[PDB]
A paper describes a structure:
CA forms the capsid shell surrounding the viral core that protects and transports the viral genome and also interacts with host cell factors that are necessary for trafficking, nuclear entry and proviral integration. Further, we assemble particles from [name] CArec in vitro and use single-particle cryogenic electron microscopy (cryo-EM) to determine the high-resolution structures of four different types of Fullerene shell assemblies. Our studies of [name] CArec show that an ERV retains the ability to form capsid assemblies using the same architecture as exogenous viruses. Analysis of the shell structures reveals the intra- and inter-molecular interactions that drives CA assembly into pentamers and hexamers and their association into shells that encapsidate the retroviral genome.
The majority species comprises 12 [name] CArec pentamers with all interfaces equivalent, obeying perfect T = 1 icosahedral symmetry. The structure is resolved at the highest resolution (2.7 Å), likely corresponding to the 32S species observed in sedimentation experiments. The NTDs of each pentamer are associated proximal to the five-fold axis and form a layer of structure at a radius of 86.3 Å (NTD centroid distance) from the particle centre. Beneath the NTDs, the CTDs form an “inner cage” layer at a radius of 64.7 Å (CTD centroid distance), and more distal to the five-fold axis. The NTD layer does not contribute to inter-pentamer interactions and so the entire inter-pentamer interface is mediated through inner cage CTD–CTD interactions across icosahedral two-fold axes. In [name], the vertical displacement between the NTD and CTD, as judged by the centre of mass (CoM) of the two layers, is 21.6 Å. In the pentamer, residue R143 located at the C terminus of α6 in the NTD makes a hydrogen bond to the main-chain carbonyl of K182, located at the C terminus of α7 in the CTD. This configuration facilitates formation of a specific hydrogen bonding arrangement between CTD residues D171 on α7 and K229 on α10 with S79′ and D90′ on α4 of the neighbouring monomer NTD (′ denoting a neighbouring monomer) and defines the pentamer conformation. By comparison, at the unique type of CTD–CTD interface in the T = 1 particle the α8 centroid displacement is maintained at 12 Å, but the crossing angle is significantly enlarged to 65°. This has the effect of twisting the interface relative to the solution state to meet the constraint imposed by icosahedral particle geometry, although remarkably, the hydrophobic interactions of A189, V192 and I193 are preserved, and although much of the polar network is lost, a new compensatory S157–E200–N159 interaction contact is present.
Numbering used by the authors:
A (entry chain A), B (entry chain A), C (entry chain A), D (entry chain A): 1 to 6, 21 to 236
Write the structure that this text describes.
């Protein structure tokens, strides 16, 4: 993080304790567990992070295979970023090397420290979305056709895998909501399909569609 | 239809020819063929139709089984109509019997003829949506899980079944668009899945996502 | 929690440490372990919790599947709450959105902070009962017929499963007590049934019925 | 079509009869039957067609799968059109949205009606070539290697499949003529190959190469 004064910026490492908490989490819970999403966001919003710090936090906390993915989507997400910065009126002078932290203009701590708040919030959204696609260690992201509720499997465990696949694959949240409610009924088992059909497209008041489908299958299982 | 003067309204049957054209179509093409959607809309927007006329056109033109479905969803769609008319400020005084054309206030030709333009446009949207769910004669509406591209089957024939299932099942058009683009890739065969993946989430300019996926699989088949 | 002054209310996050203790527990012991019932109650009674805080604590500490259940029974328990608030004389003006924390009147931190103590104690009893029905991760709640003492299984381990099933299923505690004492004798194995029958319906003094049945089978096992 | 006056342009729908004739044809004969090529050309050359009209005619007359192909090659053919308009001296100011009829400059009937004759003839050649690649409903376009004269099959039926495959695949007509005359001899059956060889590369006067090969095999068959 970059600390300030009151005009100068002083750069100080992360703590030995804080780097230890992040390692224990990703290692046990997972990188995209809801405990770590809350913990990561607590650091990103409560500190000023330059592109040099995002490398330090991620190399320590992640696996070697998981740092390859992170650096990939950080790259792939800056490319679609500049496509939107040049297509805007007025053009914004934020180029690829400033985001990624490479070249000679932006490849030191003293150089990156004097970054504007508007670029800081631009890298923060790319790096937080690059973390959302990091996979679990032996896994590969599955397709919607293969996420099917098996026999003798609880229902809320099935509709939580669906929301996982849709968070990596689909970028828009409003489009995410459309896909999950449909595949919840279609991909389910017969015993649940028995129970949902008298409720489809009808939610009484102050509730979601997903809560009403878990309530209906509540005892079915094995 | 209801013809007028210039203040009085005269009601005249459909023609012998026009009732013959509608019968030939539904019988050969289908009720929801794009030829009949255009032909039906040509009558509904170019004439004034009371609830008594929608019965005459549908009983003649459809099968006995298809008129049971039509009258069902016409009923089911008026119920969610009044739920929205009473929940509005100011309340609208359009009740169930005026839409369906029953009771004693609204069960004759002289009674229904003096309807306001605002109720006419309200029944038109319900009856045109009730026609959209009429099935093909030996068929039942399938689920999204079962619409899968078989081997030796062309690709645009597969993504046209998808848009059929999504027109009956899903009421919102913006939500329809989200479901089809996803299931197009997932439910496809391997040979197409080979071809689409280098194009997913990237469309160059002035095109749809669906046109770019049919172009890619263009020669695959059997 | 909502802290006060002496008339204003200041809202401050949970601690990084406290959110870590709750995660370790649910993850290892379980959400309804007696260690966590004591720990949760220590926070609920020793702080002021708005509906916004109950979301923060539960999303972090629970699984994605377990947060679907929690939000379901929180909804299902507010509906039977208003049924009792309107049926009372005088009517109480506590409606559904104030409990759940939705709408525009009650969907911010500054709005919810000015809640009365009587609504605070009403949401506390619903959210603490919604936590009591959260299942273990691969499990589904069983029926009383299936909770049967197997061969080579200790006796107090069997009558602890009974009290688990009766805590989720049955809402009244006085009715819970009637069901467990009966099914303890009926659902048991023969070797225990041998030992309990000379003691049924007779407890000497200052003891429970359950302690006298575990004492009797004390060495039986395998 | 766009009708005129003598400076203003009035836009009027197609007739109910004319839209009926096009539907009967494509449905029975096929979209690329020689009856429909003559009928379509009769409308395109004898009327003024804007991009809005080409959508109306094609959506009604074609299948849902066949309208996906049409819109694809209309798109793919405008892209190679602008590549030739910018590479020319002087550059022609005809851009992609004017041809396709999208954006806000060219997305209404009043906007498109004031188009110049030179753009009208440019869209006409792209849409007429997009219709030439529409496939038959269960079919996929085959490769030249697979078009082989079977046993017990007439000869002019075989060399008519060849001219079909070469019309979709190959864009240039002078190159089309070279491929068919060669593959006619090579891909044929032995009994015909017996008969053609004393005539190859020799045509007497005022005839084609193809007429002289059908004459030679005239009775062979089964």
């Amino acid at each position: 993080p970059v600390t300030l004064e009151p005009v100068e910026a002083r750069y100080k490492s992360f703590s030995i304790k804080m780097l230890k908490d992040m390692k224990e989490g990703v290692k046990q819970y997972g990188p995209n567990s809801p405990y770590m999403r809350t913990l990561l966001d607590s650091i990103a919003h409560g500190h000023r992070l330059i592109p040099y710090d995002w490398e330090i936090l991620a190399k320590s906390s992640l696996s070697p295979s998981q740092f390859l993915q992170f650096k990939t989507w950080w790259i792939d997400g800056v490319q679609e970023q500049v496509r939107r910065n040049r297509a805007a009126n007025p053009p914004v002078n934020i180029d690829a090397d400033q985001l990624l932290g490479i070249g000679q203009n932006w490849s030191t701590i003293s150089q990156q420290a004097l970054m504007q708040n508007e670029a800081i919030e631009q890298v923060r959204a790319i790096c937080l979305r690059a973390w959302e696609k990091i996979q679990d260690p032996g896994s590969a992201c599955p397709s919607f056709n293969t996420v099917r509720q098996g026999s003798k499997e609880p229902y809320p465990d099935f509709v939580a895998r669906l929301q996982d696949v849709a968070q990596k694959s689909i970028a828009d949240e409003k489009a995410r909501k459309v896909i999950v409610e449909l595949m919840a009924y279609e991909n389910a088992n017969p015993e649940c399909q028995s129970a949902i059909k008298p409720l489809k497209g009808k939610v009484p008041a102050g509730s979601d569609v997903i809560s009403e489908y878990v309530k209906a299958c509540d005892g079915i299982g094995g």
